[PDB]
Ligand binder design. Structure first.
Ligand SMILES: N#Cc1c(N2CCCC2)n[nH]c1N
Ligand SMILES: [Cl-]
Ligand SMILES: [Cl-]
Ligand SMILES: [Mg+2]
Lengths: 136, 127
């Protein structure tokens, strides 16, 4: 998957696609996604993540697809990458908590939701995180 | 290769220990071969990734190290040691605001008190 590609690239380690074209491909990926063409969107986000894995917008798009497809471990892993890339957005941490609950890891999920409540300034996200904590 | 148990668990432990032996002895080229071997065998092993990232950081391949540290952080979820080392790499890449954000994240989230002491010492040096 995207992560193994990133690691292989680093084991083995040119502006082949301009920024404007990458922007266009990202918009096409969401066109597919928004129409329910999840498989085509997944290919396009995987393509983007092969070219530029360390891009928070590409990673978040792919992580969303895996969460929808109930591939919760892959989703949680990518959301954690997204947080490392975007340290001030707790949305990926919230979604990681959801994934951990589905993975039968409620203590990991609780820690995710607690991080949101302590550190996020998104008041609506904090309510959602608290609703999960109340159920745990 | 890990998924198919191509090498027994005890032998992999030995290879990891030998990799760290080379590392501790300054035999960086040999350690790099061994940590690359480990990461081919199991790309999802956070300690194998961290070992290769450490070698790249020693060799001043700071962007390559930072890239691997981001993966290592994601796979480990709650260990901020890779984030601390990413902060060091960002300082060497002349990106002090990125480094500051890394060290601050360690302070805000980590429960590793010795690691937070180190992160704060870096924050204290950053202008
Ligand atoms: N899963 C998980 C997790 C966590 N985060 C922080 C960054 C994303 C995952 N912190 N503590 C945990 N148990
Ligand atoms: Cl993968
Ligand atoms: Cl900077
Ligand atoms: Mg607050």
């Amino acid at each position: 998957g995207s992560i193994s590609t990133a690691v292989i690239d680093a084991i083995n380690s040119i502006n082949a696609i301009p920024d404007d074209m990458m922007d266009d491909i990202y918009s096409y990926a969401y066109d597919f996604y928004n129409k329910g063409r999840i498989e085509e969107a997944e290919v396009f986000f995987r393509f983007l993540c092969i070219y530029d894995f360390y891009n928070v917008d590409y990673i978040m798009g792919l992580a969303a697809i895996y969460q929808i497809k109930e591939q919760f471990q892959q989703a949680a892993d990518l959301y954690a990458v997204a947080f490392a890339l975007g340290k001030n957005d707790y949305t990926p941490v919230f979604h990681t908590g959801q994934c951990q609950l589905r993975l039968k890891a409620p203590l990991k999920a609780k820690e995710c939701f607690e991080l949101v409540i302590q550190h996020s300034n998104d008041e609506k996200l904090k309510i959602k995180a608290q609703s999960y904590l109340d159920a745990i």
